[PDB]
C-alpha cells in the first residue's frame, strides 16, 4: 500500500519553512515518529540536512537541484520552495502541520476544536478565539 498520507503533505509543507532555522529540522525530526513515520522523503531530508549539520548547516535549493536526476520528490520539495509563504499566513506552517498530523488520532470534527484552540493558546487573538472556544465548548460537551 502506498499510503503517502496527508501527514507527509505536512512533512513536505513544513520543509517550506526557512532552511536557516535548522533547529526546526531537529525539532520536527524528534517530535515526530522516527520509528514508523520515517518516510524515504524524510530519510533523504534528514540525511542531507544532518550532513551539513555536522559541519556548516544551511540547506539550500541548490542541494535539491543537484538531486534533479535522482530523488525527484526533491522536485516536489523545490516546488514547495516555489510556493510562497508570502501568500500563506505562517499559521499554515505550525497550526496546520500539527492539525494534520494530530488529526490522525481519534479526533473527530469537534475534537479539531480542541487542538485548534490549543495550538493558538500560545498567545493568539484568543479573544476572537474565545468565541471559537465556545465552538470548542461544544467539542468538550461531546461527552
Curated annotation (Swiss-Prot):
Disulfide feature: none
Function: RNA polymerase that catalyzes the synthesis of short RNA molecules used as primers for DNA polymerase during DNA replication.
Domain description: Contains an N-terminal zinc-binding domain, a central core domain that contains the primase activity, and a C-terminal DnaB-binding domain.
Annotated family: Belongs to the DnaG primase family.
UniProt subunit comment: Monomer. Interacts with DnaB.
Name under which the protein is recorded: DNA primase
Species: Staphylococcus aureus (strain Mu50 / ATCC 700699)
Record lineage: Bacteria, Bacillati, Bacillota, Bacilli, Bacillales
GN (gene name): dnaG
Amino acid at each position: 500500500f502506498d499510503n503517502l498520507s496527508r501527514q507527509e503533505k505536512a512533512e513536505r509543507a513544513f520543509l517550506k519553512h526557512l532552511m536557516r532555522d535548522k533547529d526546526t529540522f531537529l525539532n520536527y525530526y524528534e517530535s515526530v515518529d522516527k520509528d514508523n513515520f520515517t518516510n524515504q522523503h524524510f530519510k533523504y531530508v534528514f540525511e542531507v540536512l544532518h550532513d551539513f549539520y555536522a559541519e556548516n548547516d544551511q540547506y539550500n535549493i541548490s542541494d535539491a537541484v543537484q538531486y534533479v536526476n535522482s530523488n525527484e520528490l526533491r522536485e516536489t520539495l523545490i516546488s514547495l520552495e516555489q510556493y510562497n509563504l508570502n501568500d500563506e499566513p505562517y499559521e499554515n506552517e505550525i497550526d496546520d502541520y500539527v492539525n494534520v498530523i494530530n488529526e490522525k488520532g481519534q479526533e473527530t470534527i469537534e475534537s479539531l476544536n480542541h487542538k485548534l484552540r490549543e495550538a493558538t493558546r500560545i498567545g493568539d487573538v484568543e479573544l476572537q478565539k474565545y468565541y471559537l472556544q465556545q465552538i470548542v465548548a461544544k467539542n468538550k460537551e461531546r461527552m
